[PDB]
């Protein structure tokens, strides 16, 4: 799972904008 967390900012910066 740690290797997955390493790659979290592969996603576009369009999530969780309303936090």
């Amino acid at each position, epitope marked *: *799972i740690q290797k997955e967390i390493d790659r*979290l*900012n592969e996603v576009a910066k369009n999530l*969780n904008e309303s936090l």
Partner: antibody
């Protein structure tokens, strides 16, 4: 988008068991672990365990061994939790999550006679 | 197990003010890879946790830049440079470096009056 769809609310008798499900979409189900988290009283969070959908290998929280059993069905991109011998302490919201970054909406389990 | 201690329990602030939230681990949380997998979440009432920061200081996705996470050793901190109404809710830290993964007890951000 990544989406984790969890089964609806469960009303279970003390001492019974219930199986909860989490259907994944928007990504390749077998490329990522699936994790389960318990939240009681709308606050305290506890990690239950992770399952590797590819081979079915599991990393459990020691304190949930016997209480929780994790499985997967690759053909439907679904992860399952079955909770055994339920008590009042098992009333909670149970979340599934991918990489602890994409969370389902949670499945409320209420234990009551 | 690593105990994550969050303070304060509740933090009353004025909108537009800076705010900081503390998370203390009872021991080092450095994974065998050398990285520290400390995440911060915001959870709003009746909603699932939302990831803000991962691996101590990396801002997730489109999370506003007013949020930032930092720290080292056993001190970790979440800062909000300018608190807005959509930020009100409970903040949680979460260590995924050592099994069992563990959460802090949460800090509720509220309005002072």
């Amino acid at each position: 988008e990544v989406q984790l769809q969890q089964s609806g609310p469960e009303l279970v008798k003390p001492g019974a068991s219930v199986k909860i499900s989490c259907k994944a979409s928007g990504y390749t189900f077998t490329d990522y672990y699936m994790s389960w988290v318990k939240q009681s009283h709308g606050r305290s969070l506890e990690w239950i365990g992770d399952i590797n959908p590819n081979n079915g290998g599991i990393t459990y929280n020691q304190n949930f061994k016997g209480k929780a059993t994790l499985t997967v069905d690759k053909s439907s991109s679904t992860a399952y939790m079955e909770l055994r011998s339920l008590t009042s302490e098992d009333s909670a919201v149970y979340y599934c999550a991918r990489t602890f970054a994409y969370w389902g909406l949670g499945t409320l389990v209420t234990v009551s006679a | 197990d690593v105990l994550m201690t969050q303070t304060p329990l509740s933090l009353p602030v004025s909108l537009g003010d800076q705010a900081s939230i503390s998370c203390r681990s009872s021991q080092s949380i450095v994974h065998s890879s050398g990285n520290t997998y400390l995440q911060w979440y915001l959870q709003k009432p009746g909603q699932s946790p939302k990831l803000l920061i991962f691996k101590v200081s990396n801002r997730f996705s489109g999370v506003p830049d007013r949020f930032s996470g930092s720290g080292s050793g056993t001190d970790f901190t979440l800062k909000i440079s300018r608190v807005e109404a959509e930020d009100l809710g409970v903040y949680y830290c979460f260590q995924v470096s050592h099994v069992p993964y563990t959460f802090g007890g949460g800090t509720k951000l509220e309005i002072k009056r």
